[PDB]
Design a protein around this nucleic acid. Structure first.
Ligand SMILES: O=c1ccn([C@H]2C[C@H](O)[C@@H](COP(=O)(O)NP(=O)(O)OP(=O)(O)O)O2)c(=O)[nH]1
Ligand SMILES: [Cl-]
Ligand SMILES: [Cl-]
Ligand SMILES: [Cl-]
Ligand SMILES: [Cl-]
Ligand SMILES: [Mn+2]
Ligand SMILES: [Mn+2]
Ligand SMILES: [Mn+2]
Ligand SMILES: [Mn+2]
Ligand SMILES: [Mn+2]
Ligand code: NA
Ligand code: NA
Length: 326
DNA sequence: CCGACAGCGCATCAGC
DNA sequence: GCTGATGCGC
DNA sequence: GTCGG
Protein backbone atom coordinates (compact mmCIF):
# COMPACT_ATOMS: atom_id res chain seq x y z
CA UNK A 1 0.00 0.00 0.00
CA UNK A 2 2.55 2.53 -1.27
CA UNK A 3 0.40 5.48 -0.31
CA UNK A 4 -1.99 3.88 2.16
CA UNK A 5 -1.66 6.87 4.46
CA UNK A 6 -2.85 9.40 1.88
CA UNK A 7 -5.66 7.29 0.41
CA UNK A 8 -7.07 6.69 3.90
CA UNK A 9 -7.06 10.41 4.68
CA UNK A 10 -8.91 11.02 1.43
CA UNK A 11 -11.37 8.19 1.95
CA UNK A 12 -12.05 9.51 5.47
CA UNK A 13 -12.59 12.95 3.98
CA UNK A 14 -14.94 11.53 1.33
CA UNK A 15 -16.97 9.68 3.96
CA UNK A 16 -17.18 12.93 5.96
CA UNK A 17 -18.48 15.06 3.12
CA UNK A 18 -21.00 12.35 2.29
CA UNK A 19 -22.35 11.41 5.72
CA UNK A 20 -21.94 14.69 7.61
CA UNK A 21 -21.83 17.41 4.92
CA UNK A 22 -24.25 15.72 2.55
CA UNK A 23 -21.99 17.15 -0.16
CA UNK A 24 -22.12 14.29 -2.66
CA UNK A 25 -19.78 15.86 -5.21
CA UNK A 26 -16.99 16.50 -2.70
CA UNK A 27 -17.52 12.89 -1.75
CA UNK A 28 -16.96 11.65 -5.29
CA UNK A 29 -14.04 14.03 -5.77
CA UNK A 30 -12.15 12.51 -2.83
CA UNK A 31 -12.99 8.96 -3.90
CA UNK A 32 -11.64 9.64 -7.39
CA UNK A 33 -8.44 11.26 -6.11
CA UNK A 34 -7.95 8.35 -3.71
CA UNK A 35 -8.48 5.95 -6.62
CA UNK A 36 -5.94 7.58 -8.96
CA UNK A 37 -3.36 7.74 -6.16
CA UNK A 38 -3.88 4.11 -5.14
CA UNK A 39 -2.71 2.99 -8.60
CA UNK A 40 0.16 5.52 -8.85
CA UNK A 41 3.24 3.19 -8.77
CA UNK A 42 5.40 5.65 -6.81
CA UNK A 43 5.59 6.65 -3.18
CA UNK A 44 4.32 10.21 -3.33
CA UNK A 45 6.88 12.68 -1.99
CA UNK A 46 4.70 15.80 -2.14
CA UNK A 47 1.39 17.46 -2.85
CA UNK A 48 2.84 18.92 -6.04
CA UNK A 49 3.84 15.50 -7.38
CA UNK A 50 0.34 14.30 -6.53
CA UNK A 51 -1.40 17.26 -8.17
CA UNK A 52 0.08 16.05 -11.47
CA UNK A 53 -2.43 13.22 -11.28
CA UNK A 54 -5.81 13.99 -12.89
CA UNK A 55 -8.24 14.44 -10.03
CA UNK A 56 -5.94 15.92 -7.41
CA UNK A 57 -6.26 19.70 -7.12
CA UNK A 58 -4.83 22.57 -5.10
CA UNK A 59 -6.91 21.71 -2.03
CA UNK A 60 -5.89 18.04 -1.95
CA UNK A 61 -2.33 19.09 -2.73
CA UNK A 62 -2.16 21.11 0.48
CA UNK A 63 -3.80 18.42 2.58
CA UNK A 64 -1.26 15.96 1.22
CA UNK A 65 1.67 18.23 2.08
CA UNK A 66 0.26 18.69 5.59
CA UNK A 67 -0.22 14.94 5.98
CA UNK A 68 3.29 14.09 4.80
CA UNK A 69 4.74 16.79 7.07
CA UNK A 70 3.17 15.49 10.28
CA UNK A 71 1.48 12.18 9.52
CA UNK A 72 -1.84 13.84 10.32
CA UNK A 73 -4.49 16.23 9.05
CA UNK A 74 -5.85 18.87 11.43
CA UNK A 75 -9.22 19.12 9.68
CA UNK A 76 -9.71 15.41 10.38
CA UNK A 77 -8.33 15.52 13.93
CA UNK A 78 -11.05 18.06 14.68
CA UNK A 79 -13.82 16.24 12.84
CA UNK A 80 -12.96 13.27 15.05
CA UNK A 81 -13.53 15.42 18.16
CA UNK A 82 -16.99 16.56 17.06
CA UNK A 83 -19.49 14.26 18.78
CA UNK A 84 -22.22 15.10 16.27
CA UNK A 85 -20.03 14.17 13.28
CA UNK A 86 -18.79 11.06 15.04
CA UNK A 87 -22.34 9.93 15.74
CA UNK A 88 -23.62 10.62 12.23
CA UNK A 89 -20.65 8.81 10.67
CA UNK A 90 -21.22 5.85 12.95
CA UNK A 91 -24.97 5.61 12.38
CA UNK A 92 -24.49 5.67 8.61
CA UNK A 93 -22.49 2.46 9.03
CA UNK A 94 -25.78 0.61 9.51
CA UNK A 95 -27.29 -0.62 6.25
CA UNK A 96 -30.46 1.37 5.63
CA UNK A 97 -29.35 4.43 7.58
CA UNK A 98 -28.13 7.23 5.34
CA UNK A 99 -26.89 10.77 6.10
CA UNK A 100 -30.51 11.90 6.45
CA UNK A 101 -31.79 9.25 8.88
CA UNK A 102 -28.57 9.47 10.89
CA UNK A 103 -28.76 13.23 11.46
CA UNK A 104 -32.40 12.68 12.31
CA UNK A 105 -31.78 9.98 14.92
CA UNK A 106 -28.99 12.07 16.43
CA UNK A 107 -31.53 14.84 16.84
CA UNK A 108 -33.98 12.48 18.51
CA UNK A 109 -31.28 11.34 20.91
CA UNK A 110 -30.31 8.08 19.19
CA UNK A 111 -26.57 8.00 18.52
CA UNK A 112 -25.07 4.71 19.71
CA UNK A 113 -25.39 1.04 18.81
CA UNK A 114 -27.19 0.72 22.15
CA UNK A 115 -29.58 3.62 21.45
CA UNK A 116 -30.56 1.84 18.23
CA UNK A 117 -31.09 -1.52 19.89
CA UNK A 118 -33.70 -0.03 22.18
CA UNK A 119 -35.48 1.94 19.45
CA UNK A 120 -35.90 -0.85 16.92
CA UNK A 121 -39.50 0.39 16.70
CA UNK A 122 -38.26 3.55 15.00
CA UNK A 123 -36.41 1.73 12.22
CA UNK A 124 -37.83 0.63 8.89
CA UNK A 125 -37.48 -3.01 7.87
CA UNK A 126 -34.12 -2.49 6.12
CA UNK A 127 -32.55 -0.52 8.98
CA UNK A 128 -33.72 -3.29 11.35
CA UNK A 129 -31.95 -6.02 9.41
CA UNK A 130 -28.85 -3.88 9.04
CA UNK A 131 -28.86 -3.30 12.79
CA UNK A 132 -29.46 -7.00 13.44
CA UNK A 133 -26.38 -7.94 11.41
CA UNK A 134 -24.26 -4.84 12.00
CA UNK A 135 -21.34 -6.81 13.34
CA UNK A 136 -21.45 -9.58 10.73
CA UNK A 137 -21.56 -7.15 7.80
CA UNK A 138 -18.30 -5.66 9.04
CA UNK A 139 -16.44 -8.91 8.47
CA UNK A 140 -15.01 -9.48 5.00
CA UNK A 141 -15.60 -12.67 2.99
CA UNK A 142 -12.58 -14.85 2.20
CA UNK A 143 -12.50 -15.88 -1.43
CA UNK A 144 -12.54 -19.55 -0.40
CA UNK A 145 -15.89 -18.78 1.21
CA UNK A 146 -17.12 -16.97 -1.87
CA UNK A 147 -16.34 -20.15 -3.80
CA UNK A 148 -18.41 -22.27 -1.43
CA UNK A 149 -21.23 -19.74 -1.81
CA UNK A 150 -20.99 -19.75 -5.60
CA UNK A 151 -21.53 -23.51 -5.79
CA UNK A 152 -24.60 -23.30 -3.58
CA UNK A 153 -26.18 -20.43 -5.50
CA UNK A 154 -25.43 -21.86 -8.96
CA UNK A 155 -26.58 -25.37 -8.06
CA UNK A 156 -29.73 -24.15 -6.33
CA UNK A 157 -30.40 -21.99 -9.37
CA UNK A 158 -30.17 -24.90 -11.83
CA UNK A 159 -32.56 -26.85 -9.60
CA UNK A 160 -35.29 -24.26 -10.15
CA UNK A 161 -34.67 -24.16 -13.92
CA UNK A 162 -31.71 -25.56 -15.84
CA UNK A 163 -31.92 -22.52 -18.09
CA UNK A 164 -31.05 -19.88 -15.52
CA UNK A 165 -27.53 -18.57 -15.80
CA UNK A 166 -26.19 -17.31 -12.49
CA UNK A 167 -22.98 -15.33 -12.67
CA UNK A 168 -21.09 -14.05 -9.62
CA UNK A 169 -19.69 -10.64 -10.34
CA UNK A 170 -18.73 -7.72 -8.13
CA UNK A 171 -15.19 -7.75 -6.73
CA UNK A 172 -15.31 -11.56 -6.86
CA UNK A 173 -15.17 -11.46 -10.67
CA UNK A 174 -12.45 -8.80 -10.47
CA UNK A 175 -10.35 -11.40 -8.63
CA UNK A 176 -10.39 -10.07 -5.05
CA UNK A 177 -8.99 -12.45 -2.43
CA UNK A 178 -11.72 -11.07 -0.21
CA UNK A 179 -15.11 -9.51 -0.91
CA UNK A 180 -17.38 -7.23 1.06
CA UNK A 181 -20.38 -9.23 -0.19
CA UNK A 182 -21.63 -11.53 -2.97
CA UNK A 183 -23.17 -10.11 -6.13
CA UNK A 184 -25.16 -12.32 -8.46
CA UNK A 185 -26.20 -11.57 -12.02
CA UNK A 186 -29.13 -13.69 -13.17
CA UNK A 187 -30.52 -14.40 -16.62
CA UNK A 188 -33.29 -16.62 -17.88
CA UNK A 189 -34.44 -17.07 -21.51
CA UNK A 190 -38.01 -15.98 -20.70
CA UNK A 191 -36.92 -12.48 -19.69
CA UNK A 192 -35.64 -10.30 -22.53
CA UNK A 193 -35.74 -6.70 -23.67
CA UNK A 194 -38.65 -7.71 -25.88
CA UNK A 195 -40.88 -9.40 -23.29
CA UNK A 196 -41.39 -11.03 -19.91
CA UNK A 197 -42.89 -14.39 -20.86
CA UNK A 198 -42.55 -15.76 -17.33
CA UNK A 199 -43.27 -13.84 -14.09
CA UNK A 200 -41.81 -14.44 -10.61
CA UNK A 201 -38.50 -15.45 -12.21
CA UNK A 202 -36.48 -13.77 -9.47
CA UNK A 203 -39.02 -14.71 -6.82
CA UNK A 204 -38.67 -18.46 -7.32
CA UNK A 205 -34.88 -18.20 -7.20
CA UNK A 206 -35.05 -16.36 -3.86
CA UNK A 207 -37.80 -18.68 -2.66
CA UNK A 208 -35.49 -21.66 -3.31
CA UNK A 209 -32.45 -20.11 -1.62
CA UNK A 210 -34.63 -19.35 1.40
CA UNK A 211 -35.95 -22.91 1.37
CA UNK A 212 -32.44 -24.33 1.78
CA UNK A 213 -31.77 -21.71 4.46
CA UNK A 214 -29.08 -19.96 2.42
CA UNK A 215 -30.99 -16.65 2.28
CA UNK A 216 -31.89 -15.66 5.83
CA UNK A 217 -33.36 -12.16 5.41
CA UNK A 218 -34.52 -9.52 2.95
CA UNK A 219 -33.66 -5.83 2.95
CA UNK A 220 -35.59 -5.07 -0.21
CA UNK A 221 -36.98 -7.08 -3.10
CA UNK A 222 -38.45 -6.34 -6.50
CA UNK A 223 -39.07 -7.81 -9.93
CA UNK A 224 -35.42 -7.52 -10.99
CA UNK A 225 -33.36 -6.67 -7.89
CA UNK A 226 -33.05 -8.55 -4.64
CA UNK A 227 -31.13 -7.27 -1.61
CA UNK A 228 -30.78 -9.51 1.40
CA UNK A 229 -28.76 -11.69 3.71
CA UNK A 230 -27.34 -15.18 3.49
CA UNK A 231 -25.17 -17.63 5.43
CA UNK A 232 -23.01 -20.62 4.47
CA UNK A 233 -23.98 -23.90 6.15
CA UNK A 234 -21.72 -25.13 8.92
CA UNK A 235 -20.51 -28.68 9.50
CA UNK A 236 -21.37 -30.63 12.66
CA UNK A 237 -20.64 -28.71 15.86
CA UNK A 238 -18.20 -26.36 14.18
CA UNK A 239 -18.72 -22.63 14.70
CA UNK A 240 -21.27 -20.69 12.66
CA UNK A 241 -20.30 -18.62 9.60
CA UNK A 242 -20.92 -14.83 9.59
CA UNK A 243 -24.15 -13.75 7.96
CA UNK A 244 -23.39 -11.98 4.68
CA UNK A 245 -24.94 -9.40 2.34
CA UNK A 246 -26.17 -10.74 -1.01
CA UNK A 247 -27.40 -8.83 -4.05
CA UNK A 248 -29.21 -10.55 -6.93
CA UNK A 249 -29.95 -8.67 -10.11
CA UNK A 250 -32.03 -10.19 -12.92
CA UNK A 251 -31.16 -8.71 -16.30
CA UNK A 252 -32.63 -9.31 -19.76
CA UNK A 253 -30.82 -12.23 -21.39
CA UNK A 254 -30.07 -10.36 -24.62
CA UNK A 255 -28.37 -7.65 -22.54
CA UNK A 256 -26.05 -9.81 -20.46
CA UNK A 257 -22.83 -8.11 -21.56
CA UNK A 258 -23.92 -4.61 -20.62
CA UNK A 259 -25.31 -6.07 -17.41
CA UNK A 260 -22.17 -8.04 -16.58
CA UNK A 261 -19.95 -5.05 -17.32
CA UNK A 262 -22.05 -3.01 -14.88
CA UNK A 263 -22.13 -5.57 -12.06
CA UNK A 264 -18.41 -6.34 -12.19
CA UNK A 265 -17.45 -2.72 -11.63
CA UNK A 266 -15.76 -1.44 -9.76
CA UNK A 267 -18.07 1.49 -9.07
CA UNK A 268 -15.34 4.09 -9.57
CA UNK A 269 -14.37 2.20 -12.75
CA UNK A 270 -17.90 2.23 -14.13
CA UNK A 271 -18.02 5.94 -13.33
CA UNK A 272 -14.86 6.62 -15.35
CA UNK A 273 -15.91 4.40 -18.23
CA UNK A 274 -19.39 5.96 -18.46
CA UNK A 275 -17.94 9.46 -18.13
CA UNK A 276 -15.56 8.64 -20.98
CA UNK A 277 -18.38 7.22 -23.09
CA UNK A 278 -20.19 10.57 -22.92
CA UNK A 279 -16.96 12.28 -23.98
CA UNK A 280 -16.92 10.04 -27.06
CA UNK A 281 -20.64 10.56 -27.63
CA UNK A 282 -22.22 7.59 -25.86
CA UNK A 283 -24.30 6.75 -22.84
CA UNK A 284 -23.89 3.41 -21.08
CA UNK A 285 -26.12 1.73 -18.51
CA UNK A 286 -26.64 -1.86 -17.29
CA UNK A 287 -28.83 -2.65 -20.28
CA UNK A 288 -27.31 -0.96 -23.30
CA UNK A 289 -24.85 1.45 -24.90
CA UNK A 290 -26.64 4.13 -26.90
CA UNK A 291 -25.31 7.00 -29.06
CA UNK A 292 -25.89 10.62 -27.99
CA UNK A 293 -27.72 12.85 -30.46
CA UNK A 294 -26.71 16.50 -30.95
CA UNK A 295 -29.75 17.55 -28.92
CA UNK A 296 -28.47 15.26 -26.20
CA UNK A 297 -31.23 12.66 -26.44
CA UNK A 298 -29.99 9.07 -26.54
CA UNK A 299 -30.50 7.09 -29.71
CA UNK A 300 -31.35 3.41 -30.12
CA UNK A 301 -29.20 0.63 -28.56
CA UNK A 302 -26.11 -0.45 -30.48
CA UNK A 303 -25.52 -4.19 -31.13
CA UNK A 304 -23.41 -5.82 -28.39
CA UNK A 305 -21.90 -9.30 -28.30
CA UNK A 306 -19.16 -9.23 -25.68
CA UNK A 307 -17.73 -6.85 -23.12
CA UNK A 308 -14.92 -5.86 -25.49
CA UNK A 309 -17.41 -4.72 -28.15
CA UNK A 310 -18.69 -2.16 -25.66
CA UNK A 311 -15.10 -1.06 -24.99
CA UNK A 312 -14.55 -0.53 -28.73
CA UNK A 313 -17.46 1.89 -29.13
CA UNK A 314 -15.66 4.32 -26.83
CA UNK A 315 -12.01 3.90 -27.95
CA UNK A 316 -10.69 2.06 -24.90
CA UNK A 317 -8.36 -0.93 -24.85
CA UNK A 318 -10.24 -3.86 -23.33
CA UNK A 319 -9.38 -4.25 -19.67
CA UNK A 320 -9.79 -7.58 -17.89
CA UNK A 321 -12.00 -7.73 -14.79
CA UNK A 322 -8.92 -7.82 -12.56
CA UNK A 323 -7.73 -4.48 -13.95
CA UNK A 324 -11.05 -2.74 -13.35
CA UNK A 325 -10.48 -2.39 -9.61
CA UNK A 326 -10.38 1.39 -9.33
C1' DC B 1 -15.30 31.88 -14.05
C1' DC B 2 -19.32 27.89 -14.96
C1' DG B 3 -21.52 23.91 -15.08
C1' DA B 4 -20.93 19.30 -15.17
C1' DC B 5 -19.77 15.40 -12.31
C1' DA B 6 -22.90 7.59 -14.33
C1' DG B 7 -26.94 5.54 -14.14
C1' DC B 8 -30.75 3.36 -12.04
C1' DG B 9 -33.93 -0.31 -8.71
C1' DC B 10 -36.49 -0.28 -4.42
C1' DA B 11 -38.99 1.58 -0.05
C1' DT B 12 -41.31 5.44 1.45
C1' DC B 13 -43.76 9.34 1.53
C1' DA B 14 -46.99 13.45 -0.02
C1' DG B 15 -50.22 14.80 -2.91
C1' DC B 16 -54.32 14.22 -6.00
C1' DG C 1 -55.06 3.65 -6.22
C1' DC C 2 -51.66 6.48 -9.04
C1' DT C 3 -47.49 9.64 -9.90
C1' DG C 4 -43.20 11.62 -8.73
C1' DA C 5 -39.80 13.38 -5.34
C1' DT C 6 -36.80 11.73 -1.88
C1' DG C 7 -33.52 8.55 0.68
C1' DC C 8 -30.70 4.77 0.23
C1' DG C 9 -28.51 1.47 -2.00
C1' DC C 10 -26.18 -1.43 -6.29
C1' DG D 1 -13.25 19.36 -4.96
C1' DT D 2 -11.66 19.07 -9.80
C1' DC D 3 -11.61 20.00 -14.54
C1' DG D 4 -12.36 21.26 -19.71
C1' DG D 5 -13.61 24.94 -22.21
O1 LIG E 1 -22.40 3.17 -6.88
C1 LIG E 1 -22.33 2.05 -7.39
C2 LIG E 1 -22.27 0.81 -6.68
C3 LIG E 1 -22.13 -0.34 -7.35
N1 LIG E 1 -22.02 -0.39 -8.72
C4 LIG E 1 -21.77 -1.67 -9.42
C5 LIG E 1 -20.28 -1.89 -9.67
C6 LIG E 1 -19.89 -2.76 -8.48
O2 LIG E 1 -18.74 -3.57 -8.72
C7 LIG E 1 -21.12 -3.65 -8.35
C8 LIG E 1 -21.28 -4.35 -7.03
O3 LIG E 1 -21.53 -3.42 -5.98
P1 LIG E 1 -20.84 -3.59 -4.54
O4 LIG E 1 -21.37 -2.50 -3.68
O5 LIG E 1 -21.17 -5.00 -4.18
N2 LIG E 1 -19.23 -3.43 -4.72
P2 LIG E 1 -18.04 -4.47 -5.16
O6 LIG E 1 -18.59 -5.84 -5.35
O7 LIG E 1 -17.23 -3.87 -6.25
O8 LIG E 1 -17.06 -4.53 -4.00
P3 LIG E 1 -17.24 -5.17 -2.64
O9 LIG E 1 -18.56 -5.83 -2.56
O10 LIG E 1 -16.24 -6.23 -2.45
O11 LIG E 1 -17.28 -4.04 -1.67
O12 LIG E 1 -22.22 -2.74 -8.59
C9 LIG E 1 -22.11 0.77 -9.48
O13 LIG E 1 -22.06 0.77 -10.69
N3 LIG E 1 -22.26 1.93 -8.76
CL1 LIG F 1 -20.97 18.81 -3.04
CL1 LIG G 1 -5.63 12.33 10.33
CL1 LIG H 1 -25.72 -6.33 -23.88
CL1 LIG I 1 -31.90 1.40 -21.79
MN1 LIG J 1 -19.99 -6.74 -4.01
MN1 LIG K 1 -23.30 -5.80 -3.59
MN1 LIG L 1 -24.69 -13.78 12.59
MN1 LIG M 1 -11.57 10.06 -21.56
MN1 LIG N 1 -51.23 9.94 1.28
NA1 NA O 1 -4.23 17.10 -10.91
NA1 NA P 1 -25.92 3.05 5.88
Amino acid sequence: TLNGGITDMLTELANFEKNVSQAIHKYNAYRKAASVIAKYPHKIKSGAEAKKLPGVGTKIAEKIDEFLATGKLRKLEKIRQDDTSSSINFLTRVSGIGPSAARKFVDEGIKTLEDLRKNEDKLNHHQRIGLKYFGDFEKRIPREEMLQMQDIVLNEVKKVDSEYIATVCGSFRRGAESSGDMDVLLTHPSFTSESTKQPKLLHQVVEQLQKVHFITDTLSKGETKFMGVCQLPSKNDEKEYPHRRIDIRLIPKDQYYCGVLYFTGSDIFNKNMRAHALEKGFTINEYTIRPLGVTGVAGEPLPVDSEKDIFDYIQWKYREPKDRSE
